[PDB]
């Protein structure tokens, strides 16, 4: 600590190294994460005091400094001053990516490895925000450079994978947009299963979830009896099955020619 200070005031980031005029030391900048086979490293044998200047864009929470006096077998000192910096975490997520290995296998790629939670999201064709499916699903822990195995029965262009850390949204990868896209006008049905042969059918509408059959003037409530039939007839696509829940994607193209009388 008394040898390192940080100044983010010179519109850039400065590492003020407060050592004596005569001090000889090894300096190494690193990203505190397993990187693999031999990669070129950031290293400098110096004669301090020095000011190492970095760009606000280089900041990541695992960006650490290693110092050691230039003496044989000298011990190395490690400091991580960006662990809780707001800008670092900001840049970290800009550089993070979620990928598909298999439908039931996802992988997170990030420079640093922070605790994160992931869950499936449902995007409506009308531009309106992507509503996550918690419940009946849950935010499950997603670890950087480790496989996330979700029991997704089928991919859907309307499904996006959401990533949160520090209970804030950071990633929204619509994994089936190029492969199965664009967005289908399918109603999502959420049957919440429970005790005493319980199953409550609900329809994820832009204006929240509506239980079926309903007396509303809302598209899915009006078509309630028809959607309940599509499902029972097996015309609806099962996206997720569980002991206490099921997700269903019901296409609405069959109702595209239905018109109301004029009043």
């Amino acid at each position: 600590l008394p040898w390192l200070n940080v100044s983010a005031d010179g519109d850039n980031v400065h590492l003020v190294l407060n050592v004596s005029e005569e001090q000889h030391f090894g300096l190494s900048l690193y990203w505190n994460q397993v990187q693999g086979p031999p990669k070129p490293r950031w290293h400098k044998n110096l004669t301090g005091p020095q000011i190492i200047t970095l760009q606000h864009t280089d900041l990541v929470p695992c960006l650490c400094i290693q110092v050691w006096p230039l003496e044989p077998d000298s011990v190395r000192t490690n400091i991580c001053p960006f662990r809780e910096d707001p800008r670092a975490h900001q840049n970290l997520w800009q550089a993070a990516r979620l990928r598909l290995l298999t439908l039931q296998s996802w992988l997170l790629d990030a420079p640093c490895s922070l605790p994160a939670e992931a869950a499936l999201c449902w995007r409506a064709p009308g531009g309106d925000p992507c509503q996550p499916l918690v419940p009946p699903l849950s935010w499950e822990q997603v670890t950087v450079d480790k496989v996330l195995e979700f029991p997704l029965l089928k991919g859907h262009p309307n499904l996006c994978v959401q990533v949160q850390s520090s209970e804030k949204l950071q990633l929204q990868e619509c994994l089936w947009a190029d492969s199965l896209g664009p967005l289908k006008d399918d109603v999502l049905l959420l049957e919440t299963r429970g005790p005493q042969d319980q199953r409550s059918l609900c329809a994820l509408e832009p204006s929240g979830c509506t239980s079926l059959p309903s007396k509303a003037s809302t598209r899915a409530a009006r078509l309630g009896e028809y959607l309940l039939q599509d499902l029972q007839s097996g015309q609806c696509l099962q996206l997720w099955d569980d002991d206490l829940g099921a997700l269903w994607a019901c296409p609405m193209d069959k109702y595209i020619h239905k018109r109301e009388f004029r009043h």
Partner: antibody
Amino acid sequence: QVTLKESGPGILQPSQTLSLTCSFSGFSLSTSGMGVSWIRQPSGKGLEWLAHIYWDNDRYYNPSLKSRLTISKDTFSNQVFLKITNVDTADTATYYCARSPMNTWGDYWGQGTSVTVSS
Amino acid sequence: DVVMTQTPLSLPVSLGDQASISCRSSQSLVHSNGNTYLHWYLQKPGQSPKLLIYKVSNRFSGVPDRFSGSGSGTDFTLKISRVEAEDLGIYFCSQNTHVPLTFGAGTKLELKR
């Protein structure tokens, strides 16, 4: 009182064109909101709506019969018409016209005209 | 098409009795404008249908207080309080929320003996 009277040939052969006329009194198709619908009823069966026309000439048809129906009107003569092309036995019915303004669809019906389609 | 399921199809009653007729639609009759275009008609032999109730519960001009309509969404009921001989005939429900406009099969209100 509102009165409507349907007219047309009593018997036609299959493939012929049925031309129906609804002559009315007690209302005008120049009146904003006013409309007239055509409905049919095969003997001892349920009613089947055919077509509707509003005062502004907006027209609606039964989608299953759409290509065979044409509804039209003559406001000056107080008449509404229905043309049904390529008739067949299923077109055998009593045909009704009914005053159908925007708030009260089919609020006054004519006494109907019987049509038999047979070879 | 919106199917109008009318029950019972035959309704034997005694004069002075109350009669109840049910109409269930295959989908909600609530229009985008918020109204429910469900009507009840009576048809007598050799005669044309006469409008009794419009928009679920509104009695048409000249219709007696003994006729009342109720219900919402997909479930509707016509109640006739003190059945008279002039009430005997076929009652039908109709909807005009959706194109095509559709009707129930009819309930024949008949006399018991």
